[PDB]
Write a protein that binds this ligand. Sequence first.
Ligand SMILES: *[C@@H]1O[C@H](CO)[C@@H](O[C@@H]2O[C@H](CO)[C@@H](O)[C@H](O)[C@H]2NC(C)=O)[C@H](O)[C@H]1NC(C)=O
Ligand SMILES: *[C@@H]1O[C@H](CO)[C@@H](O[C@@H]2O[C@H](CO)[C@@H](O)[C@H](O)[C@H]2NC(C)=O)[C@H](O)[C@H]1NC(C)=O
Lengths: 488, 488
Amino acid sequence: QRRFPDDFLFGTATASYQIEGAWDEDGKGENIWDYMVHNTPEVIRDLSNGDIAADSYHNYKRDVEMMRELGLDAYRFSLSWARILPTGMANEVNPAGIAFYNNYIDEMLKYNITPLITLYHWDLPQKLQELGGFANPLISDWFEDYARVVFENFGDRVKMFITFNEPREICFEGYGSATKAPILNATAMGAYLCAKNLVTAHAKAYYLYDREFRPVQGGQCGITISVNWFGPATPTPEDEMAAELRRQGEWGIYAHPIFSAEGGFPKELSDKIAEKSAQQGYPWSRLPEFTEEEKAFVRGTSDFFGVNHYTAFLVSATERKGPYPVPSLLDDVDTGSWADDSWLKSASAWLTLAPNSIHTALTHLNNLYNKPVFYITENGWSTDESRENSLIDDDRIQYYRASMESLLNCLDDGINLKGYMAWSLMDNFEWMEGYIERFGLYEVDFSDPARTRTPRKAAFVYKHIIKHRVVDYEYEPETMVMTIDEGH
Amino acid sequence: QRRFPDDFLFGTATASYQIEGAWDEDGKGENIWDYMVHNTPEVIRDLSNGDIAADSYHNYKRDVEMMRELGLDAYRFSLSWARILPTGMANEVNPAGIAFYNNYIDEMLKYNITPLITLYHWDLPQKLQELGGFANPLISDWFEDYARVVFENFGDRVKMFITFNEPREICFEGYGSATKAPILNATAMGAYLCAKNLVTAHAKAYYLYDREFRPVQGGQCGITISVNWFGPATPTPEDEMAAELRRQGEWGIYAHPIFSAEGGFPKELSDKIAEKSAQQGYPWSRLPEFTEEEKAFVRGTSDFFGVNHYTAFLVSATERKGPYPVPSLLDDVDTGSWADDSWLKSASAWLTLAPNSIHTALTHLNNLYNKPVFYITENGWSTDESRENSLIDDDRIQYYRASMESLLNCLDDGINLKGYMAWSLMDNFEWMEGYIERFGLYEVDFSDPARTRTPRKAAFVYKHIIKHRVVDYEYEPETMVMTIDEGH
Ligand SMILES: *[C@@H]1O[C@H](CO)[C@@H](O[C@@H]2O[C@H](CO)[C@@H](O)[C@H](O)[C@H]2NC(C)=O)[C@H](O)[C@H]1NC(C)=O
Ligand SMILES: *[C@@H]1O[C@H](CO)[C@@H](O[C@@H]2O[C@H](CO)[C@@H](O)[C@H](O)[C@H]2NC(C)=O)[C@H](O)[C@H]1NC(C)=O
């Protein structure tokens, strides 16, 4: 039997806007999601919002009770910048926001669950957005100041910080298009400008931690990037090339500056954007090139490579290029992309069960970026909220076991992989998709004001994998009621 | 009797959004006023907008005919950034946009009227505002690119450029509160952030002009700043000190970096902000102090001091302090201000006929900033739309004649004043006041599709002053019909 080492960290992950609720309580400022869903509710598919969500603001002791039921080693959550600094700036630190996170953290440590904190998981204060947000290079400073408040208030107890979660979803989807707040839809340059400012913010936050808190606190600071596998649709030179560009456009622009030896943006995509910008009449490249000291400043600034990974894609230089805006990043990249029709489908169009996809992605990164320290910070499966017998999720179980096998392949290739976090502990507000797509190991009842969390079959399977450290394909729980085991 | 020398440039001024109309014609992009008024029309007192305005886009030939009738030496108008560059960036230069400004200009020159062009008079493309506008340091570079296009296209014929009209109205009113688009109301630091970015954009446009255009074109590049006189309410050290600080807050903040010997922001106001910011718990000052390199970059970057001046105010250290937001610019300044109640009142609350105010403001500047070249780029009087017999404007006559006397006092004092531009050639969209407050020498019928222009009595008085170069207090126009005197 292949076995997970005892020290391998199993957890789950959530994000503040998706679970907390209490959106205008105890002095919390308005964020870009609050702003969007209140002004244009129609952008959410089921017309719902995160005003209450899973109400973790009030129900955090139950959340920890659920982590214990699972036997988790660690839990990854995010901090709401506007709950902590309602104006966005560090002149006003909200003590109710700080008390809550201290309460949640302290509850975790009481039962020996390791906290992993993400500083930014998509909920910028609306007041900062008014000033340009991630399009404004001053975001580096605002973020540095926020990171100080976070490290000094929580760093005594929390030893693993993530600056940003999924830059692509921040930059491309939020600034370069209309699929995430703040739906700026600045297709020509938004994504690239955001990219540059975000990785510079990261770097500043990193040097702060390294300079002013690491010596006393002894933790680590990193970043998480979404790295799905993108491979060539046909084993052809032109599709090998298309896939390479697609990777650079999907995650290379964010990872390269931080994790490459030389720094800056990926070279191939950079030349193609430059060519495109000139043909289009811009007196410079829509992709701002790094100066040599900017490259130096940003590279080397991560203690680990956090990887959010779900799936795989086939990429074609010619086929099935859905009409993209011009100019735009996906037009710059110039490729079509899709799932193999045989791969198991979830309730989310982009999400399929691609066999061994974690191992494929990490092997590529491990060779490309000089064998860094890896954590899988998100991986999971969506099911439709309308499903009959929604607590019985054999498809989710299938997906988790396949991810586990792929994690075990990574370990027997000597990839320095230290942990896995399932997305998500419980159902939550799934951005533009609202409550239609459910990722929880625990189901939440969003009609019920107590927001009762009930374990799905897969919660028991994950519990079983964590405890036994192997995947037993014959395991099915006899009872669907959770207990906490001894020592947890 | 005193006399204006023959070389004195008499003209009038207008701004693009206030007169042009054609707000979405011929590829023109959305600007911040289009956006504000179409999304929240109620912010305009009379529920008006500039969709059509005086329709100068179509009526420009009649506009020039009106300059001829007045016998103007010169005409100051603004260029619409979004009409020229619909996306805000220099990739697409809108040909119908350029053609319109080339037609307007070539018509002025055909009848020997000198064009003075303002690059920015408050109509930022909405696409650039989405990225933060003047809150975003990258505005410097966007503006420089826009300026290149302006100097390239029009500098062969236009030898006088003004970068920005009235930085206070842009920054304080627009970003620091809710009285101008884009009504961001970022009271704590919006004004100060904008201030820094605007004087930096100015300086870049200036060095661009100086290096790449001036040697061939032989023109000048300047800025216009609103400098109303602010004097002490009582002859007291406390009210002297209050008046100085108020001057620094209203205009010094914008003028000092560009026009003083040392550069940077004014010292007294800066220490005051740093003190307030410290006791408000900010980790730095809300006024970003210039580095030594920044101070040298921005200082010395104007060929003349364009002055918008209308009136004067009395200032107290203790009395009549309106309710100011905390933090804010007026709260940092911490003064009360009001017009002397004995002065003649116009249809605008802020605007009174303060006797000899031009001379008082300019004398102060002349001594403060070492004898620069001055133009009065705006000066004028407001009357109510509803006024009975709106073509008879003896109060306007009084204002203008007092202004002429004040200019002659300046010339007699040896102040290097080169010209005067009356606001405005015609009635136009008066921002938040719509068409309620009328400033025109010519009245416009805004319910008429042809937007007929008809001269007020004041048009005949101004025409007389330009012809004979003296103020005749006994002169009263014979006719209400206007003609072009030969030689014009
Ligand atoms: C976001 O911006 C894009 C690009 O400006 C818009 O997409 C286009 O709009 C027209 C009209 O709908 C389409 O026919 C074109 O295919 C697109 N234009 C270009 C230049 O590629 C899109 O509509 C905007 N989205 C939202 C939600 O406002
Ligand atoms: C712009 O911001 C100002 C300053 O915050 C707002 O003025 C006040 O509004 C709040 C309401 O929460 C009051 O409690 C304060 O007392 C007000 N300040 C003053 C000086 O009276 C104002 O509401 C905002 N303007 C908008 C949104 O148009």
